[PDB]
């Protein structure tokens, strides 16, 4: 009810599309909060995170209720995965590891209010106006867009990020605050190899076999050694010997500390 806007207040340009997911498209939108602010519209066509408030978490900033609409920040950069990959972008190696150190952050806060993610990856991380690295693509604002990376579940209908998941998840389709730290160490070598796709060479279901094998994404050449150590241990097969996001903010922090 207190999350709610007027219709009034809000301007979906229908015509200025963000993106195109699966349950329904993003928009620019200008909302009256009373200063006029430029915003992001996803539409719910097709078919709690109001409390959640952390620097480098996506905030809600309100619903409109009229197909429902679901009003976000607008993210001046876009996603992580682009802008690193956008090769007139200049990120360091000490710019690349603050992003991942920014997704630890929001990551911790997740998992201490008790909230798994499911589905962490640098395409799901936005980016605002101060490059404040924003955990996105949860609770409302939850979507398939590039469906490339996902395996839809024949029986749950569950959408299944197979090369980001864990060798538990992909075994059993259960996710814990140990499996999104697994993706975690998947998003740092996205981060440290400014967007490559993983594990190119192995088909999705030669994943299974290969993570079987103790087989792991091999050091990308920019990546300091002490960073791929975060990584491995992020992948080890088994969730309980994993570090948590508050050791991971520790030794991450510590990382670039040293630059
Ligand atoms: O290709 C894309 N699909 C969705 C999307 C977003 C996005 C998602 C979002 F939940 C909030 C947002 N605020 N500003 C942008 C934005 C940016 N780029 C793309």
């Known amino acids: 009810q207190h999350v ?30 009373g200063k006029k602010i430029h915003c992001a519209v996803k539409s719910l066509n097709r078919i709690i995170m109001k409390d959640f408030s952390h620097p480098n978490v996506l905030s809600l900033l309100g619903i ?5 609409l679901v009003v976000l920040p607008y993210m001046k950069h ?3 995965r682009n802008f690193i990959r956008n090769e007139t972008h200049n990120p360091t190696v000490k710019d690349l590891i603050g992003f991942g150190l920014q997704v630890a952050k929001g990551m911790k806060y997740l998992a201490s209010k008790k909230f798994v993610h499911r589905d962490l990856a640098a395409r799901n991380c936005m980016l605002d106006e101060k490059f ?15 469906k490339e990376y996902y395996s839809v579940h024949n029986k749950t209908g569950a959408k299944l990020p197979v090369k980001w998941m864990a060798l538990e ?6 996710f814990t605050t140990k499996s999104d730290v697994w993706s975690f160490g998947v998003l740092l070598w996205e981060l440290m190899t400014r967007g490559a796709p993983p594990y190119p060479d192995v088909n999705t279901f030669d994943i299974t076999v290969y993570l079987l094998q103790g087989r792991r994404l091999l050091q990308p050449e920019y ?28 030794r991450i922090s510590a990382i670039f500390s040293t630059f």
């Open 169 to 174: 998840s992909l075994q059993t389709q259960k």
């Open 64 to 68: 409109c209720l009229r197909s429902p």
């Open 78 to 80: 876009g996603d992580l």
């Open 132 to 146: 404040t690295v924003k955990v996105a693509d949860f609770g409302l604002a939850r979507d398939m867009y590039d």
């Open 223 to 250: 990546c300091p050694d002490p960073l791929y150590e975060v990584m491995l241990k992020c992948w080890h097969p088994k969730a309980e010997m994993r570090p948590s996001f508050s050791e991971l903010v520790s």
């Open 4 to 33: 709610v806007i007027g219709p009034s207040s809000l301007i979906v340009h229908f015509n200025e599309v963000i993106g195109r997911g699966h349950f329904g498209c993003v928009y620019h939108g200008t909302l009256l909060d």
